[PDB]
Each structure stands twice: as structure tokens, then as C-alpha cells.
Antibody, heavy 120, light 108 residues
Framework: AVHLQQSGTELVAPGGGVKLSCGASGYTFTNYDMNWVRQRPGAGLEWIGWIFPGDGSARGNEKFGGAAALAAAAAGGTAYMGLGGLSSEDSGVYFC?????????????WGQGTLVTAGG | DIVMTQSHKFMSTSVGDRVSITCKGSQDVNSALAWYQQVPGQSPALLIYSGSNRYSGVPGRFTASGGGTDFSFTISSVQGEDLALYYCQQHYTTPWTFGGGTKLEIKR
């Protein structure tokens, strides 16, 4: 029973960052890298970046260079994505995603999504 | 950045019919391509891995082909619960990117 459980809805004001979480269970956390994806109405599904729980590596989409900080906490089996200085351009649903095999970077496991809404 | 184009935002079909959605990566991404299905309020579900391989638990009416720059997702006999969104994704070179999606809808 592999599973990714994400945290609740976020109502955030301009400026001010927010850090989201993803509790991973059913598999050894460090064995797989955690990925993050963004989904907005227009603009679509966009890959954010990844992090390895084995050593803390961080490869990120140029498009999210400053906006996202991917940190992971072992003993938590938990992953986090800290978002920057939220403008409305950041309002959307954020997904926690993992692979299934290790010969396919396809995302076979997904969190249920965390809705972030930026309003003042 | 590789670009995945799903030309048909919407595609009309019927229950019991056959459909084919197409994707076109701007570059040759060989076989590094995935297909996902998404239903409202839900996260994407992996349907196809490596261009033509089914994922686990994924039904037989779901097929996919391609291996180069053009890829096609296919449903042998469409069921009422397949009238969702299908996303294209390239995992050949970063940054990973997704197509804009194709929503299947019932013709009437």
C-alpha cells in the first residue's frame, strides 16, 4: 500500500511564503526521490523539481528557480516544498509525486494535492 | 525546454467507440514518455509508461504507441468513466514537461 498524503488547503496573502508537506508511507522513503508538480487552470501541469532523501539533492525547474525550496525530513518519511513570495500567479494545486519503477521516471504515485490560494 | 503539443483540447466520442489522442514532442524523446488520466478533484493517474507500456492495474482498453516525436493514446472501446482528461509527459530530459491535455467528451 504505497501512499502519499498531503497537507490541507492554504489561504495565503501576497508576500509570505508557505511550506507544504507530503507524508510518504508504505515504502522506504530514502529509496525514492520525491517530485513536485504544479497545476493551474490555464498554464496546465508543470513539473517543479525533485529531492533525494538519501543525501538531500535538489534538482529544480529553471522556471521555479527561486519560488520553490525542496527539503526532506527522514524519520518523518516526510517531504516538504517551501514556496516563496506568493503572488496570485502562484495560486493553484500542488502535487507530491513519486516513481513506480526505477527504469521509468514516470510518476506512478501521487499525493491528493494541496490547494494554495493567494488572496489578501 | 521540450514542448508537448496536444492539438485537440477536446475530442468527441461515444460509449462503445474507439478514440485516439495524439501528442507531439518538439524533440525526439525516444521512448521516454508517459500518459496520465485525471478526473476532477483528483490527482493524475499513470496509465502508460515508456511510450507503449501499461502500468499495473490499468485495463486492456488502454493502449498507447509512438516512439520518436509523435505519440498516440488509444481506447479500444470507451466507457462512461473514460470521459476524462489525458495528459502527455516527456521524461527524457529535464525540465520534465506535460502536454496541455485532451478532454474526452460525449458526442450528442
Amino acid at each position: 500500500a504505497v501512499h502519499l498524503q498531503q497537507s490541507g488547503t492554504e489561504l495565503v496573502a501576497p508576500g509570505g511564503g508557505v511550506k507544504l508537506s507530503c507524508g510518504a508511507s508504505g515504502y522506504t522513503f530514502t529509496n525514492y526521490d520525491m517530485n513536485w508538480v504544479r497545476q493551474r487552470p490555464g498554464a496546465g501541469l508543470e513539473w517543479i523539481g525533485w529531492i533525494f532523501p538519501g543525501d538531500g539533492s535538489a534538482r529544480g525547474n529553471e522556471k521555479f528557480g527561486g519560488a520553490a525550496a525542496l527539503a526532506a525530513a527522514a524519520a518523518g518519511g516526510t517531504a516538504y516544498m517551501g514556496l516563496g513570495g506568493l503572488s496570485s500567479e502562484d495560486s493553484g494545486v500542488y502535487f507530491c509525486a513519486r516513481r513506480g519503477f526505477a527504469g521509468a521516471a514516470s510518476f506512478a504515485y501521487w499525493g491528493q494535492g494541496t490547494l494554495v490560494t493567494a488572496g489578501g | 525546454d521540450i514542448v508537448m503539443t496536444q492539438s485537440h483540447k477536446f475530442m468527441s466520442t461515444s460509449v462503445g467507440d474507439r478514440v485516439s489522442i495524439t501528442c507531439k514532442g518538439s524533440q525526439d524523446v525516444n521512448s521516454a514518455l508517459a500518459w496520465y488520466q485525471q478526473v476532477p478533484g483528483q490527482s493524475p493517474a499513470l496509465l502508460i509508461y515508456s511510450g507503449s507500456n501499461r502500468y499495473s492495474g490499468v485495463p486492456g482498453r488502454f493502449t498507447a504507441s509512438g516512439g520518436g516525436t509523435d505519440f498516440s493514446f488509444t481506447i479500444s472501446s470507451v466507457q462512461g468513466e473514460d470521459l476524462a482528461l489525458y495528459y502527455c509527459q516527456q521524461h527524457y530530459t529535464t525540465p520534465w514537461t506535460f502536454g496541455g491535455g485532451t478532454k474526452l467528451e460525449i458526442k450528442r
